[PDB]
mmCIF file of C-alpha atoms in Angstrom:
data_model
loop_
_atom_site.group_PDB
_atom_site.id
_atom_site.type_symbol
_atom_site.label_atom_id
_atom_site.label_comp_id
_atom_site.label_asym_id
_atom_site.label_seq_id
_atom_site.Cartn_x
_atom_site.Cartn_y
_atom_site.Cartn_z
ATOM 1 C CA UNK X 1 10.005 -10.540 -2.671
ATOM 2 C CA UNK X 2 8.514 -9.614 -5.852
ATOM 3 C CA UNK X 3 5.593 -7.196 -6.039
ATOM 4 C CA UNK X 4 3.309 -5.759 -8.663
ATOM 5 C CA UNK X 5 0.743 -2.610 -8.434
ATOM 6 C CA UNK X 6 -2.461 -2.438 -10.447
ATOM 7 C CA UNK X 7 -5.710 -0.778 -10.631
ATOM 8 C CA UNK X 8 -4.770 2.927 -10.857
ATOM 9 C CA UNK X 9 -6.900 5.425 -13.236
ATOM 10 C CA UNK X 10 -8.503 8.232 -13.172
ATOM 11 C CA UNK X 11 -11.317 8.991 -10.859
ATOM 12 C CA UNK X 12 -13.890 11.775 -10.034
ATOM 13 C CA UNK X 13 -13.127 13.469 -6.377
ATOM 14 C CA UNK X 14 -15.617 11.819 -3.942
ATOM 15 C CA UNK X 15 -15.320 8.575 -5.667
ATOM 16 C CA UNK X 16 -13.541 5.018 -4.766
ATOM 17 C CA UNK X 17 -11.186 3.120 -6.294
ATOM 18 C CA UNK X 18 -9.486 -0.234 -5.355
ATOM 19 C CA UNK X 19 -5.643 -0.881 -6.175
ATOM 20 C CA UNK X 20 -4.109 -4.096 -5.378
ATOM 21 C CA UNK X 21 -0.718 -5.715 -4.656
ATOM 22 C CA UNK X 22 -0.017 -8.919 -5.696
ATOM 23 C CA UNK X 23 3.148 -10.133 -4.269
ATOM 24 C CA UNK X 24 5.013 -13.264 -4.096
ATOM 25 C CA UNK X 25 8.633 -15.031 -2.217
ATOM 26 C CA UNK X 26 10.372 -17.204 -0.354
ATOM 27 C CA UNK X 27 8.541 -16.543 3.027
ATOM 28 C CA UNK X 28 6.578 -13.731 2.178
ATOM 29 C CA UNK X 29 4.115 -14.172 5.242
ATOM 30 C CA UNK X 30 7.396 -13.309 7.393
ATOM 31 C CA UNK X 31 7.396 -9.839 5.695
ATOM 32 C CA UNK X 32 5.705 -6.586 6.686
ATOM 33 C CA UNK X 33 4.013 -5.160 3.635
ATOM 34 C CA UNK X 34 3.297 -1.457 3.034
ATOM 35 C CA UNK X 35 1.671 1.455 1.118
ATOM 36 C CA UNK X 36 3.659 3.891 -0.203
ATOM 37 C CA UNK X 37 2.318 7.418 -2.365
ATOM 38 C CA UNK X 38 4.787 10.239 -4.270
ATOM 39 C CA UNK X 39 2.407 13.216 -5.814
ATOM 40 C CA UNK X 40 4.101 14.840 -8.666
ATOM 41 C CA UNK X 41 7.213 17.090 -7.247
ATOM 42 C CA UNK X 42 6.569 15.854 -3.742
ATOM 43 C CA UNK X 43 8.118 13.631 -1.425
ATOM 44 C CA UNK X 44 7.177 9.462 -1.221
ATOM 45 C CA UNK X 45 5.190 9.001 2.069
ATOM 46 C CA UNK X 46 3.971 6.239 3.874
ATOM 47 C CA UNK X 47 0.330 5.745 3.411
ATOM 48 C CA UNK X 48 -0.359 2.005 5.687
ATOM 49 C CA UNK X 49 1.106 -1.288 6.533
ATOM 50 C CA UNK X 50 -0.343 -5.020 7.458
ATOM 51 C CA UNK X 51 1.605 -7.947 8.210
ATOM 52 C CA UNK X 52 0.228 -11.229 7.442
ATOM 53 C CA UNK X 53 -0.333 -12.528 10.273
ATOM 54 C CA UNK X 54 -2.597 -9.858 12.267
ATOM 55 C CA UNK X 55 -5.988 -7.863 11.441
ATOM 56 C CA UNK X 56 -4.458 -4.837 12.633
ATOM 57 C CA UNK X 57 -3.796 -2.050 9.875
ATOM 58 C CA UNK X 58 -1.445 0.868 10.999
ATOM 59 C CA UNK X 59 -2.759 4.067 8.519
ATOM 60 C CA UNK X 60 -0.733 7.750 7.999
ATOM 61 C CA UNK X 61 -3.180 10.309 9.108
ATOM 62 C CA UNK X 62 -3.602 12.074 5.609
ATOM 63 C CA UNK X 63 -5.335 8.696 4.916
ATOM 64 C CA UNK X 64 -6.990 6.903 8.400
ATOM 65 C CA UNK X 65 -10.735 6.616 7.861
ATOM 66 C CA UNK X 66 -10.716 6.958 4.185
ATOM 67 C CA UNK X 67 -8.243 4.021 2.929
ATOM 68 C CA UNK X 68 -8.668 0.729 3.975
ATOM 69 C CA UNK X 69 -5.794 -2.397 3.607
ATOM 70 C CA UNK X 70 -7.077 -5.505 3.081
ATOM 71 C CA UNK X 71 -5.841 -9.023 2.295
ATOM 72 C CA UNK X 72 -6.665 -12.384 0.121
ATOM 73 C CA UNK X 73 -4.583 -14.803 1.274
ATOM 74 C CA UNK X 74 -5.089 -17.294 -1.413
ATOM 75 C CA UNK X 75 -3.867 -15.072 -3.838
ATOM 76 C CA UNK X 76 -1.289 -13.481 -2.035
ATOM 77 C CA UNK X 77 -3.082 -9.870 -3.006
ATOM 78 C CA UNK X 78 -2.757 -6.985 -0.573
ATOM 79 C CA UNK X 79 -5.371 -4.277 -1.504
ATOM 80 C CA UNK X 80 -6.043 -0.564 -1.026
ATOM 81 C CA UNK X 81 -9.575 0.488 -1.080
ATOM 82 C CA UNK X 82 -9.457 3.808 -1.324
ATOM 83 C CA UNK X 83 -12.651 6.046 -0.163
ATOM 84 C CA UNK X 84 -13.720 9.507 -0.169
ATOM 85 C CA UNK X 85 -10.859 10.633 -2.858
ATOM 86 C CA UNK X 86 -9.419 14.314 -2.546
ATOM 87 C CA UNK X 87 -7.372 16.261 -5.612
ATOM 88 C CA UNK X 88 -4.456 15.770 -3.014
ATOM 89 C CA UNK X 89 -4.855 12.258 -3.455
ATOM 90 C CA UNK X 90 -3.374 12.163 -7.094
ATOM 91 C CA UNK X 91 -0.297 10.257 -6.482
ATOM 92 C CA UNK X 92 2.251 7.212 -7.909
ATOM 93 C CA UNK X 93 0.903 4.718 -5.297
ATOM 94 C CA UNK X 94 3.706 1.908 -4.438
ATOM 95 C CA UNK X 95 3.597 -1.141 -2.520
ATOM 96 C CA UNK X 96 6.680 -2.674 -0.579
ATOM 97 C CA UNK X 97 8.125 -5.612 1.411
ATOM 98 C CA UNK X 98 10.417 -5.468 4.223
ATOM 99 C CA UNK X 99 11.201 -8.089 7.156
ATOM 100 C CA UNK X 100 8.745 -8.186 9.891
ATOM 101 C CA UNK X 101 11.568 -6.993 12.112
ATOM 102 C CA UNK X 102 10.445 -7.163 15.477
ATOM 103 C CA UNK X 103 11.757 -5.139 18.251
ATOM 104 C CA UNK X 104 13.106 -2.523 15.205
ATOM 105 C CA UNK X 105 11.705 -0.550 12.486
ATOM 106 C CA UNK X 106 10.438 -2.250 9.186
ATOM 107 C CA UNK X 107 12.947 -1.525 6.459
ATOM 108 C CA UNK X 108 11.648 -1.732 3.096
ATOM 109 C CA UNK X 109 13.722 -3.761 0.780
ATOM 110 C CA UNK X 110 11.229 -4.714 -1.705
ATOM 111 C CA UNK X 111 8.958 -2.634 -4.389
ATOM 112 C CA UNK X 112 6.796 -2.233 -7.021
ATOM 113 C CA UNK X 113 7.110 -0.373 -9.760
ATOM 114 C CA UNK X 114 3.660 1.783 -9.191
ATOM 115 C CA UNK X 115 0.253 2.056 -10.404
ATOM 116 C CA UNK X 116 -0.396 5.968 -10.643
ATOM 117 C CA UNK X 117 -3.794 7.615 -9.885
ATOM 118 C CA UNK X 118 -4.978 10.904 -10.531
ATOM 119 C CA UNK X 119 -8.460 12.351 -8.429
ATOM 120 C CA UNK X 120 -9.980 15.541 -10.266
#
């Protein structure tokens, strides 16, 4: 799987923004596909996941209710709308591909190379 990050900048706390994910590969509906963020000196952390074939979005706490994943399927695009910004939501924001291995965790074999966002 091959993915690519856009949309970052530089936005006013309070605000919105909208990144997006476009991905592409052999089977790619197969895979899980995630959010990923790493603020400056701090650890990556999982922000949300969808898998193709479900409505259901799985969010990290630090996020659920303000950042929404969403899909278009003719473009193969994953999104992240992000709402309601906080400072503490400056970040390198990544997506990523792994299997949709059921009955195990997702491992995430594929990524992006970022698109970075800072919140004042």
């Amino acid at each position: 799987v091959q993915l690519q990050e856009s949309g970052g900048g530089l936005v006013q706390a309070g605000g919105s923004l909208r990144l997006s994910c476009a991905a592409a590969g052999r089977n790619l509906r197969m895979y899980r596909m995630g959010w990923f963020r790493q603020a400056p000196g701090k650890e990556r952390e999982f922000v949300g996941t969808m898998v193709w074939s479900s409505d259901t979005i799985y969010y990290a706490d630090s996020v659920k209710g303000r950042f929404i994943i969403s899909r278009d399927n003719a473009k193969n695009t994953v999104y992240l709308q992000m709402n309601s910004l906080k400072p503490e939501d400056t970040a390198v924001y990544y997506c990523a591909a792994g299997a949709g291995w059921a009955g195990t965790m997702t491992d995430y074999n594929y990524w992006g190379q970022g698109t970075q966002v800072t919140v004042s």
